[PDB]
Scaffold this active site. Structure first.
Site, PDB file in Angstrom:
ATOM      1  N   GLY A 197      -7.279  -0.835  -2.778  1.00 51.64           N
ATOM      2  CA  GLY A 197      -7.752   0.332  -3.637  1.00 51.64           C
ATOM      3  C   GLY A 197      -7.604   0.377  -4.716  1.00 51.64           C
ATOM      4  O   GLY A 197      -7.804  -0.206  -5.496  1.00 51.64           O
ATOM      5  N   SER A 198      -7.921   1.546  -5.087  1.00 50.72           N
ATOM      6  CA  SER A 198      -7.977   2.463  -6.652  1.00 50.72           C
ATOM      7  C   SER A 198      -6.468   1.550  -7.251  1.00 50.72           C
ATOM      8  O   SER A 198      -6.311   1.821  -8.212  1.00 50.72           O
ATOM      9  CB  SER A 198      -8.201   3.374  -7.451  1.00 50.72           C
ATOM     10  OG  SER A 198      -7.290   4.696  -6.382  1.00 50.72           O
ATOM     11  N   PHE A 199      -5.073   2.572  -6.628  1.00 48.74           N
ATOM     12  CA  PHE A 199      -4.381   1.900  -6.869  1.00 48.74           C
ATOM     13  C   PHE A 199      -3.406   1.473  -6.248  1.00 48.74           C
ATOM     14  O   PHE A 199      -1.761   1.238  -5.915  1.00 48.74           O
ATOM     15  CB  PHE A 199      -3.531   3.315  -7.647  1.00 48.74           C
ATOM     16  CG  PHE A 199      -3.478   4.314  -6.556  1.00 48.74           C
ATOM     17  CD1 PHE A 199      -4.651   4.646  -5.495  1.00 48.74           C
ATOM     18  CD2 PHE A 199      -2.442   4.393  -5.434  1.00 48.74           C
ATOM     19  CE1 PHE A 199      -4.987   5.955  -4.528  1.00 48.74           C
ATOM     20  CE2 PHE A 199      -2.120   5.780  -4.522  1.00 48.74           C
ATOM     21  CZ  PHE A 199      -3.155   5.845  -4.186  1.00 48.74           C
ATOM     22  N   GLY A 200      -3.316   0.953  -5.514  1.00 45.48           N
ATOM     23  CA  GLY A 200      -2.032  -0.170  -4.208  1.00 45.48           C
ATOM     24  C   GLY A 200      -3.374  -0.827  -2.818  1.00 45.48           C
ATOM     25  O   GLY A 200      -4.482  -1.016  -3.459  1.00 45.48           O
TER      26      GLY A 200
ATOM     27  N   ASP B  81      -7.790  12.104  -5.980  1.00 46.83           N
ATOM     28  CA  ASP B  81      -8.963  10.824  -5.299  1.00 46.83           C
ATOM     29  C   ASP B  81      -9.739  10.913  -4.052  1.00 46.83           C
ATOM     30  O   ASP B  81      -9.727  10.059  -3.651  1.00 46.83           O
ATOM     31  CB  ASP B  81      -8.143  10.214  -5.774  1.00 46.83           C
ATOM     32  CG  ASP B  81      -8.233   8.544  -5.756  1.00 46.83           C
ATOM     33  OD1 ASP B  81      -9.618   8.300  -5.486  1.00 46.83           O
ATOM     34  OD2 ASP B  81      -7.360   7.778  -4.945  1.00 46.83           O
TER      35      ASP B  81
ATOM     36  N   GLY C 248      -6.487  -3.912   2.778  1.00 46.73           N
ATOM     37  CA  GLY C 248      -7.382  -4.438   1.973  1.00 46.73           C
ATOM     38  C   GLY C 248      -6.526  -3.904   1.182  1.00 46.73           C
ATOM     39  O   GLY C 248      -5.775  -3.085   1.280  1.00 46.73           O
TER      40      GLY C 248
END
Ligand code: ANP
Ligand code: ANP
Ligand code: 4BM
Ligand code: CL
Ligand code: MG
Ligand code: MG
Lengths: 276, 312
Positions: A20-23, A130, A18
């Site tokens: 997320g915010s940056f990868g 984060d 999956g």
């Protein structure tokens, strides 16, 4: 290649987990199981790449029992972060997807170990940037491993030497001053503390904050302006009063009013002992 | 529904195709090409092999408890009842492989966001037809289903080479909206000022969003903050500051002289910050701009294919 850089074709990249915010995370094999995060920043400038390598030199030295092991990075075929693969589920999955029933002695212990790992990160002068329950793993159902810390250089695409920082991924753990993105340095030890405060909220309530608000932009605006904050009355009845107080201190709107992790860790450890 | 003869013909044809579509299963689809990606989803053009149909398949990856997921899939089933010339048709919603799929009609013109990039600016007379379609879509959703759109913006108004203009991505599932609020962020916002402050005035916020969208398509640029001076005569803010601007600054407006007075009044009435003084759907439908647009013959399909580079 460079220090702690894994050459092309050494990682067998397996299944996509999956993003997320940056990868985007893949399960991989490289001297055992690894998580491989393909960074969104695919096209990095020489300045960005250099600052990223400097940051990797820091991150690779952050070894501690409550910190997910940083294992290496790749530039070819694409920019990537290689970390320890976690067996089992993140704390986010346990609390909000599986709905694992932990007892209070074990909720406190998860918060203790997290504060322990965060205390280490700050002792090494590393802002996590984060923290959230998706980035806390209960490894083999025992040890807390904090992941996805630092990496400021790749949490924004670069136009030369300047980078514009934009909110990415879930906002639930962001301090008011992180939401606002107005100060010179919105990220700080104290903004990590706030995020930890929210993690405490999840542990002590079983719920994400703002469960009664489905309008994300209302949350961004009102949290950012200080008009909205977690409903501390959702805290379960068996939560020790001292844990509720600690939570409220971590969640103070003004960052300068938030304690630091040596004091937070000392409070949780005291609470763990003065507990049935 | 009202429906001219052509609209009822296309609506019937869609229901006919939909009868060919039984249960949707991941194995029955073949990827054709990507249609786009939002900040929480990705949309593919696909072939549904059992039925022969081409559809647009939106996939949403949500890490949510199965009870919430199942409720989302239940609520989406109401989309089978959302049949209107101004609403993107629907084939099915299911869960598989960690992904929520929402399978809809494929709109070959794309969204008005894409169209806006290819056009530079969208002409007022085209914007009149868009406004009629949006007003009528929002009216259909509110009157026939009690649904509030909650996400009106150029990327959620779809068009096609037949000239249809249709709303999509409206709030049929409050569980889906909530799950997405927890998981993603935008970079800009069309949310009305009163909802930013936690005040709920039914569809008045969709009307605000429409007005904002009409200004952006008229001038060719997302209009928060307003264009600065010489920028306008050629005729980046973070998410929180944009929201703060919406709440605390006067609403945007069209440039004077460039647009008709009716169109300027129409968007002004949409963009009143007071959600009660803001026009509602009944009042907009009889506004002078709409009365004029509704009577103009505009080859919308012709203009769109020309703008996009397609054939007639
Ligand atoms: N080291 C790891 N071991 C196992 N699974 C992991 C690991 N890191 C991430 N994952 C999983 O991979 C998926 C994507 O994670 P990730 O891209 O980090 O997004 P996120 O944690 O939800 N938010 P963020 O880390 O802030 O971008 C999630 O399902 C994670 O649980
Ligand atoms: N039925 C459809 N037919 C054709 N193209 C479509 C269809 N639905 C969506 N698209 C395209 O897919 C793109 C991505 O859609 P979406 O995932 O909803 O994000 P978005 O609306 O573009 N932006 P955002 O909502 O802010 O995340 C849209 O902008 C359209 O270009
Ligand atoms: O899709 C939605 N928002 O945009 C999603 C983007 O991926 C965000 O990036 C959405 C939100 C709430 C809801 F109830 C829905 F039904 C939604 N989807 C949706 C609704 C109607 C049709 I006809 C087709 C659709 F797909
Ligand atoms: Cl790959
Ligand atoms: Mg993560
Ligand atoms: Mg959309």
């Amino acid at each position: 290649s460079d220090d702690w850089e894994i050459p092309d074709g050494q990682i067998t990249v397996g299944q996509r987990i999956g993003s997320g915010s940056f990868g985007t995370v893949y399960k991989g094999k490289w001297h055992g199981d690894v998580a491989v995060k393909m960074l969104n920043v695919t096209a990095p400038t020489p300045q960005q790449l250099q600052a990223f390598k400097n940051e990797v030199g820091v991150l690779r030295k952050t070894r501690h029992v409550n910190i997910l092991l940083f294992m290496g990075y790749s530039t070819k075929p694409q920019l990537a972060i290689v970390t320890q693969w976690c067996e089992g589920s993140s704390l986010y999955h346990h609390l909000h997807i599986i709905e694992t029933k932990f007892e209070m002695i074990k909720l406190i212990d998860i918060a203790r170990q997290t504060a322990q790992g965060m205390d280490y990160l700050h002792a090494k002068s590393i802002i996590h940037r984060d923290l959230k329950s998706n980035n806390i793993f209960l490894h083999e159902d025992l040890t807390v491993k904090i992941g996805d810390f630092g990496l400021a250089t790749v949490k924004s695409r670069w136009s030369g030497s300047h980078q514009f920082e934009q909110l990415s991924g879930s906002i639930l753990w962001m301090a008011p001053e992180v939401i606002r993105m107005q100060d010179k340095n919105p990220y700080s030890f104290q903004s990590d503390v706030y995020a930890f405060g929210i993690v405490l909220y999840e542990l002590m309530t079983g719920q994400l904050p703002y469960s009664n608000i489905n309008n994300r932009d209302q949350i961004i605006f009102m949290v950012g302006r200080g008009y909205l904050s977690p409903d501390l009355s959702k805290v379960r009845s068996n939560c020790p009063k001292a844990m509720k107080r600690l939570m409220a201190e971590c969640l103070k709107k003004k960052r300068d009013e938030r304690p630091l992790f040596p004091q937070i860790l000392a409070s949780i450890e005291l609470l763990a002992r003065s507990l049935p | 529904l009202e429906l001219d003869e052509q609209q009822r013909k296309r609506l019937e044809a869609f229901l006919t195709q939909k009868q060919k579509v039984g249960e949707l299963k991941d194995d029955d689809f073949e990827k054709i090409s990507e249609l786009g990606a939002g900040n929480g989803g990705v949309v593919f053009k696909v072939s549904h092999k059992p039925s022969g149909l081409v559809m647009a398949r939106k996939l949403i990856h949500l890490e949510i408890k199965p009870a919430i997921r199942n409720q989302i899939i239940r609520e989406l089933q109401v989309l089978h009842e959302c049949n209107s010339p101004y609403i993107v048709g629907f084939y099915g919603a299911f869960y598989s492989d960690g992904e929520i799929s929402i399978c809809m009609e494929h709109m070959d013109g794309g969204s008005l966001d894409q169209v806006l990039k290819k056009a530079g600016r969208i002409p007022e007379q085209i914007l009149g037809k868009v406004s009629i379609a949006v007003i009528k879509g929002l009216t259909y959703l509110r009157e026939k289903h009690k649904i509030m759109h909650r996400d009106v913006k150029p990327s959620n108004i779809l068009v096609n080479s037949r000239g249809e203009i249709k709303l999509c991505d409206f709030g049929v599932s409050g569980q889906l909206i909530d799950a997405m609020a927890n998981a993603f962020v935008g970079t800009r916002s069309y949310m009305s000022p009163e909802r930013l402050q936690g005040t709920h005035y039914s569809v008045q916020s969709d009307i605000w969003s429409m007005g904002l969208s009409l200004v952006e398509m008229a001038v060719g640029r997302y209009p928060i903050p307003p264009p600065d001076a010489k920028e306008l005569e050629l005729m980046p803010m973070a998410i929180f500051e944009l929201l703060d601007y919406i709440v605390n600054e006067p609403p945007p407006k069209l440039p004077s002289g460039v647009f008709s007075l009716e169109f300027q009044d129409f968007v002004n009435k949409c963009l009143i910050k007071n959600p009660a003084e803001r026009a509602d759907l009944k009042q907009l439908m009889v506004h002078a701009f709409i009365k004029r647009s509704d009577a103009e013959e505009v080859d919308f399909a012709g203009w769109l294919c020309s703008t996009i580079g397609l054939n007639q």
